[PDB]
């Protein structure tokens, strides 16, 4: 039962996400990606070695590439959530509420899978952008990604695998205290099952792990603070970077945050 639950979620994870932490760790360790570290190498990656609204500048171009990836991750997470039979039973409007307030939390948790202290993978792992380069972009674009790295570095210390992330992401999305939920008791009931499956799965997959389950519950709270600060950055960019095109889907997500 609780094992069949964890297996069903893990299969939905494998079936809906192109880049798993397993694959990403193969590329990051060397079992190679083109390194994008300055304007010169960025342009070479665009020509064909690695790869949108009209061009504007280098910083905005990086923004557009990150924006497209997150939009794609939003699509995958939507199919992941739907692949959970309990989630699909909720009314479509409640489904939209869970995704609205949950995707960025899941996205940032999965971002740690393709990230180390020096950069992150891009374009199905065929490229690698250095943390230095992102830092050197024009404000405020250089301030967006740095808090994600600091979270990711600490999150990867836990050394979760794809089987853990599937349940961890499922618990992020099925959060009972999202604003505007119609059937709060139903969602909370689904989350409690997922959480019980998570601890159950962690006991078997990480026997020697001390406090791993409560640490993940703290990580979930961290992710909510990370998204709150991320939503503010994006709202400030909407006000001061009027020339930067914001994706309408991400606009709706941030609309009331
Ligand atoms: O509004 C939005 O959320 C879209 C915009 C999101 C976004 C724009 C952006 C621009 C720069 Cl110069 C640095 C980080 C940036 N981020 S991010 O930190 O959130 C990010 C970066 C890479 C990535 N690869 C899979 S996911 C994912 C997420």
Residue numbers in the entry: 174 to 204, 209 to 228, 235 to 440
From the paper:
When compared to the LBPs of other nuclear receptors that have 600–1100 Å3 cavities, the LBPs of PPARα/δ/γ have relatively large (1300–1440 Å3) cavities that are able to accept 1–4 ligand molecules.
The “so-called” PPAR pan agonist lanifibranor indeed activated all PPAR subtypes with EC50 values of 398 nM (for δ) < 572 nM (for γ) < 4.66 µM (for α), and equivalent efficacies (13.3% of the maximal responses for α/δ and 24.9% for γ). Our structure seems more reasonable because the interaction of the carboxylic groups of lanifibranor with the four consensus amino acids contributes to the stabilization of the AF-2 helix 12 so as to facilitate the recruitment of coactivators in all PPAR subtypes.
